[PDB]
Design a protein around this ligand. Sequence first.
Ligand SMILES: C[C@H](CCC(=O)NCCC[N+](C)(C)CC(O)CS(=O)(=O)O)[C@H]1CC[C@H]2[C@@H]3[C@H](O)C[C@@H]4C[C@H](O)CC[C@]4(C)[C@H]3C[C@H](O)[C@]12C
Ligand code: ICS
Ligand code: ICS
Ligand code: CLF
Ligand code: CLF
Ligand SMILES: [Fe+3]
Ligand SMILES: [Fe+3]
Lengths: 522, 522, 97, 386, 376
Amino acid sequence: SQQVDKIKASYPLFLDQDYKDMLAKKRDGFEEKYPQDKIDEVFQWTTTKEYQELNFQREALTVNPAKACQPLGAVLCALGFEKTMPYVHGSQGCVAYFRSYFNRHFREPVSCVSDSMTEDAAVFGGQQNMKDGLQNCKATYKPDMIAVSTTCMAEVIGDDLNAFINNSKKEGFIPDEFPVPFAHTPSFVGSHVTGWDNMFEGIARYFTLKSMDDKVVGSNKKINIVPGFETYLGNFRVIKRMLSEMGVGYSLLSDPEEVLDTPADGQFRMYAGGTTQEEMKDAPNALNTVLLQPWHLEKTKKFVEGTWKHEVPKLNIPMGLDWTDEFLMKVSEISGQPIPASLTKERGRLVDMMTDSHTWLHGKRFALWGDPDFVMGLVKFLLELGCEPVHILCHNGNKRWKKAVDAILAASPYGKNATVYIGKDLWHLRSLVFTDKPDFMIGNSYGKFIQRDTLHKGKEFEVPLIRIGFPIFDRHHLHRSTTLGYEGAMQILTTLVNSILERLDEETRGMQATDYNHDLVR
Amino acid sequence: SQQVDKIKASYPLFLDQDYKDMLAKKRDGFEEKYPQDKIDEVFQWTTTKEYQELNFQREALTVNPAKACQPLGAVLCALGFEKTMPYVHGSQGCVAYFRSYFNRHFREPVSCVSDSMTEDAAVFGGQQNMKDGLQNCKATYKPDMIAVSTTCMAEVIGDDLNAFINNSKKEGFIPDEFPVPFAHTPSFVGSHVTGWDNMFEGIARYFTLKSMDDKVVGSNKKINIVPGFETYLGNFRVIKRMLSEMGVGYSLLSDPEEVLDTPADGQFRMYAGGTTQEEMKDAPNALNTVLLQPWHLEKTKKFVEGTWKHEVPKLNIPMGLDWTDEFLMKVSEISGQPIPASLTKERGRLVDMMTDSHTWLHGKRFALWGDPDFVMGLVKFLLELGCEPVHILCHNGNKRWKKAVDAILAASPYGKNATVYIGKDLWHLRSLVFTDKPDFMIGNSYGKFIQRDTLHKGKEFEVPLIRIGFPIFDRHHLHRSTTLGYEGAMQILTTLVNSILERLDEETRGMQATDYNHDLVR
Amino acid sequence: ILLCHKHPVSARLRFLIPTGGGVVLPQTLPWQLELIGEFRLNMEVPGQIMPIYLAALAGHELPPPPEGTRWIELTQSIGMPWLDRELLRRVYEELIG
Amino acid sequence: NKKSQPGLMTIRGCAYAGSKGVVWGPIKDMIHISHGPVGCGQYSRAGRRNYYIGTTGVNAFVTMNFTSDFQEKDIVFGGDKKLAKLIDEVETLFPLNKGISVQSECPIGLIGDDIESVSKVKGAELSKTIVPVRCEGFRGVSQSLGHHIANDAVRDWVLGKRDEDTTFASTPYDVAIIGDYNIGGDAWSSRILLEEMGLRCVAQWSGDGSISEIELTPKVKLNLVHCYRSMNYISRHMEEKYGIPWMEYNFFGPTKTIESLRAIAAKFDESIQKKCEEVIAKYKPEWEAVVAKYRPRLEGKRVMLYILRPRHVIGAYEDLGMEVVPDLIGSGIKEKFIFQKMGIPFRHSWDYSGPYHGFDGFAIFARDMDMTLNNPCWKKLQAPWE
Amino acid sequence: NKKSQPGLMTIRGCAYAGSKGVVWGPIKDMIHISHGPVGCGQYSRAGRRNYYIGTTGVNAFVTMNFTSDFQEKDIVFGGDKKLAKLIDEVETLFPLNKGISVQSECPIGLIGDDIESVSKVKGAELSKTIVPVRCEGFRGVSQSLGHHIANDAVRDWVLGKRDEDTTFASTPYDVAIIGDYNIGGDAWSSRILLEEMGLRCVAQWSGDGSISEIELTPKVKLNLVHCYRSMNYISRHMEEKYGIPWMEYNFFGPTKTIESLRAIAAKFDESIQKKCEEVIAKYKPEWEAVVAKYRPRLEGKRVMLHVIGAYEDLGMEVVKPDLIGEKFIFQKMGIPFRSWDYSGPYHGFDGFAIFARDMDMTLNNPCWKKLQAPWE
Ligand SMILES: C[C@H](CCC(=O)NCCC[N+](C)(C)CC(O)CS(=O)(=O)O)[C@H]1CC[C@H]2[C@@H]3[C@H](O)C[C@@H]4C[C@H](O)CC[C@]4(C)[C@H]3C[C@H](O)[C@]12C
Ligand code: ICS
Ligand code: ICS
Ligand code: CLF
Ligand code: CLF
Ligand SMILES: [Fe+3]
Ligand SMILES: [Fe+3]
């Protein structure tokens, strides 16, 4: 039943008595459900430490992973170039899932095509698929460039991207001069950040490898900036703004913030902004190349140091205070530009906010997860705030990254109770937060379910989720936030302290029970 | 009892059994408290429509007001000028309260002095207090200018500010050429915004009244911007940024964002930035003067139009979409500068965000309160979003402002269930949100108690608070937010939609009860 | 003699004045009491120069006023003639100021 | 049902999406392993709003993501041993699961993996129903072949489990809801109407579906199929094997809902018809009030739809006086923001709203259509200075 | 205790802040009208953290702001009729209030308003205790005169309300906590120790204070004063009138807490002394563990400032100070700074743990070590 004055959506319409009775009848008569006491007992068991021992003994089963596959990152990297079409040679379902994922995170159109590889392609190969797809894509969407990645199907059957594209150009399906960079992105190796790295390395090799004879390091007096897999448009914006404030000539390669923030003015823009092909061709002439996320840009670093002859600085992600300082100092040293007074004032204002909120931030326990560089930057900033990152999870991390994060934690008194987990999923983290309860957990939207689980054990066991990372699906416009630089640290600090304050306000809203601490001033 | 491993603050230390027993013994033995069922009955009565009728018949009692007194606004206006000391001629307790209030809102040092008028001043006046205070303030803090307001003491005893300052200059307590603008700010007239208006008019008169012979309108090809009582530094910043993007020369009179955001670098800065005396003296030479918050800048508008001969445009507060558009068009018309493509792109991005969030925002019921211009701008933006304002409360509003807001509501189909209240306090709003429950409240920190009260009636009756306005005491760094322009509209939209989504997530977090609607993608 | 009590903690200055008129003691102007040496004031009455000194009542508790006398504050002097108001102001400035 | 042109932004999904995402995933008490690399399981995790009641992680697992997480060694050497070890770990960590399905991703059918033998061996060892689904994404041209493969798996592994069991107490009013995936509670809104008609909904899958309901489906008297495209295979098989007639029911909009209710009641005796008339009379004022409120705001508007068989959603749009051919367009999330960029009001996922089926869902549908079509945001696309 | 120099930045409050903010406001079951313009009541609303137990708006009104909201007409023609109508409306809308105080702001005493007569008339008519407080802010040099005026109002209108009432059953272990305003729950942390000692805290005001507790205060055997500066007037008055001895107790730091507990127990018989010894023995391991955890990370640090003992118990010198006990100015200078801001309790053994943790948190926070930009 519905009242037209107040129409109820699914919640709380299905809380109505008739719906409750119908659901109870269904469950009791035909679902053959386990008894509620047995369900409660099993849940309590899953919250225990012995269940954690069983869970961490997993070798073949992955439950709720915290990573994606390479071609998603390859598509994201391809989206950062001017009038460039991401083209995933392989099955269509992969591209549909990539587009849906990025649409849900960014709430923007995401352009990506597939050559619709099918059983016939599984038998004889996707060469005809590649030719037809490249021709159709160029004719229909008129891109300046087509960046080709692969699905697991094409990698497993062993399609040669180079030979396929060469045959497509040779037989006249696409012009010989049309830029078609490619990258092999096996979804069974690494993660989405690895795919981003592979796509960027392939594009750089396509545009620079054969024309290094006339390239001189430092000719254009610019600094190449490779952001890596980044899903915060504010990160690109803050990097560009800080480098413009410094007066530093820069080339931001794979800049997708324009195409992911197109205005609504009655016209659909298929492409917007992006790194130009001239910028990629002139990249070796830069003074140096700075990798914003070096821990998933290893192949890019190898190519840039080995081919462009760029002495890539050993820089952490510019996240927090110390690492933003080191990034700014390295940029100043490379470019010869002093750090302007505006950036010094912004750093001082970030320090002022840290001083303002240290009373509420100090000693707070956090379980966090995400990509390696983002996770280590968040851990560094939390240590700078006096917080305790007790559970550090990175499903796509490696042993070297774990060693680096352990070294970072050992350098801080607030990392004593911190453990770094690599190759673990969010079920492992659910066990960790049940057995060693943190105050909060920082991660993507997939953490919300964990919070639900904790709330099922009790309100006192609930671990609230702070949504920083990728992907964020249950909130709107968080992709516009910033996590890099002093501005990103400021936003992160505000989010953390305000989350602590909402949690305290909720815990003290009980009248005549806990409202004695429901302070107006905090 | 405290465990050194897990130390408990007041919450939840006083929830311990021993503390509960001690509090129960204290209540039962000596407090002579009313019975618990009896308190419950009285509370339920206070939530009723009969109690609302009894509440709205109040004529002499004000409970939980939503306004401050004039000298606070005068101090805020004075802080916006370069090397200017706010000086409240009157009693010291007023200055102490003003400083504490602004310190708690901004989490920054706030400079303000008093002449410590006491019983001797109550009997003889504060002329000697004025002389000594001006001399000591100039000697101790070395301000370029001392901006003088009044407490209710000096207004009641009829202290002549002009005569007192002139006698102080005559007798050598301060130099004759030292700028000492003054304004009478009776705390029993209007509110803090009235004090801001009075202080700004006094400063402008002091700097321009006697030198209008050599002033020609449009000589400096700039536009004067008067922000009014503004406690969001982001609003000053966004106004300046939008004017710079348009290429429009501007003079932001009373700009306190620098002194209210001093960086922490081991050095304390009493003064920072602010409108210079040259800018005030050259203000009549501007093309026009634009009042950001016209509904509390009546005296400023009268002085600007009657002395500077500026044709002040009929502009609303640049809040939301339509009014920001109108402000930009008026600035373009006055200055001759076209609106650049960057501002058009920002407007389109705001429209895109509105389109993305309209499904969650449409039909939501809001009870809001604050200053008149801020309240009307928020109402206009909510009508633009398809939301339904139901209780529009402005304690310091007047009949003309209420008529304007009613005209705005009548122009939109989403204002049919909207009622505007002027002269009503937050107890009236508590009655309103009990009897006619909205989805959310939008207001300062003082609304949190109202939320608590609603939660005491039941979880289904709880009205969550959204902290937009002044003062915000229980959150950190919200004063850095923006409410003006497209940027402020995006920030407000994000806050509203994410508050809605957070409330929905909280309501659907119950496992096997309501978590069928705990959607990952929202 | 001008009689007053200043509290050692709150610095509340109460003046012991005749209940009829004026503030001077023991006569209309034409306990452990300690004299304030730094305070001196002279009034030119016809044919005589008259000095008036300040006596401070020591302790924490205000004693009840004798007959015909009252304890008043500076604010309570509103409406009283200017001369003794100024005398009270001088005492207040010396003691409180 | 032809091959889509390569490189033309095809909107169709894969066989895995049509099998795991659509048919098998909503089954709450079963655990569904996305066999292969991590991407397919990650992108499909909780993507569809197939609503269910249960304790997630204990007895329900719909929004969970179980995957074998194939690495390079699993591609090179196969993943059958890994599949067996994963099944053992699933049993040891989720003991209350009432069945396991293994949905194959693309590499499974290419590296010559034999998941059927592993499924049989582990099911015999654990006395558990393990359903191998060869829903490799490269198979077929869309999710239709995924639906077909998932239906064949249901028929071959779950449907006939209770063929020799006659202990179920059957009534003449036994119906099974097939093909309703409970998007935002659509199946619940249909089931409340069906049960208020005096019918007993014995089975309801996939949406809010249990494996026991799939096994009990051959015991029903009528099969009410919501989505013909995805479950026509199983409906036809059930008709030719158990002699169970199947009919398509449309509960989208009051007119189609009333017509379908009368058509369903016409398959039973007079008491069911009387209860159908009673239900229609009871719900007439509610949808009449919804129409009176929202039709004036929506009369004359034009709609184009590209999402299923046509005329399914046309009835509800006509019930609001909305001409169907634009003031509104209904498609997926991938085209949603594109048509938003064109500035045309836009409404698969039901835009995180619902239910839209039945009388209760009609109110939500009308409110959502009015909200999207009449939102002021669509009137602010043009900058007033342009 | 002299007038502050005019034109200087000082943190001194007014008599209204001393009376309404400190002494009268924490009384939970009473309604306090800030008589005058809106500002004084608005800025003082919930400013101090005088913790209390009660249903706000029904039977407790500490965090609420009742004001006359004086307009120009009220200034010109007086606000006595407005005060009477306001009292009637207060009784109408808040029936469960156990008393009304009228705290005067600056204009009330300057326009010749007689709130004493209005209070007497309305209290006689409504059978309610209405306490007029002549706490005009211009009176006095600081909040000390506010404390004095509020204490005088307590004595004149509330304290003697049960002078002839002998229906209260008294025990030899009757004590009243005076001058503790329960900042973050300090008074509760003191009261738990006092009642563990075998004493019966009959009265505890202002913090978490009821008007009945004030009326019962003259019936106790000992008056334990926390803040001598604000309540010495009422303490001496009770000593001279009811013959009740008063002593200052200091529960700040384990050493001072132990000394104060023993001093209080010395006033009573041997059983109270034995209970005090049991309390000290029970709480010894907890504060010893707190010291063992926090003193090594706080030893030798200099503090620039009753509260000495807790700092010494953490091994901190008191006087380049590492901490200063004007908060934001010292914050800008870069020296850690510590009514308690947003934490507490700090008194008692339970409060000592919070005090030590907060001192370690503020003094050793990395934010103080990041002031200097690495390139400057
Ligand atoms: C008793 C319960 C099973 C009950 C059952 O068999 N229900 C079958 C459902 C069917 N019925 C009976 C409830 C309905 C009917 O069929 C009615 S009828 O017969 O058709 O008339 C068994 C099965 C799974 C077991 C838990 C898990 O191992 C994890 C864990 C391991 C630890 O070491 C010890 C604790 C834990 C929690 C175990 C406890 C307990 O040991 C559980 C709940
Ligand atoms: S199954 Fe099909 S795409 Fe028939 S794959 Fe798809 S829950 Fe659509 S038009 Mo998403 S043939 Fe169902 C469908 Fe229709 S997932 Fe749902 S809405 S009625
Ligand atoms: S009342 Fe006094 S100034 Fe005794 S006016 Fe002041 S909450 Fe201080 S040293 Mo603020 S005599 Fe209390 C005080 Fe002490 S406001 Fe608090 S900290 S213990
Ligand atoms: S058509 Fe379908 S969704 Fe595509 S792979 Fe094939 S079953 Fe799966 Fe999977 S991990 Fe990523 S998303 Fe692919 S490239 Fe492979
Ligand atoms: S010293 Fe004290 S706080 Fe000051 S006024 Fe006087 S009682 Fe009050 Fe009040 S409304 Fe504003 S803050 Fe004043 S100017 Fe008057
Ligand atoms: Fe968008
Ligand atoms: Fe600050």
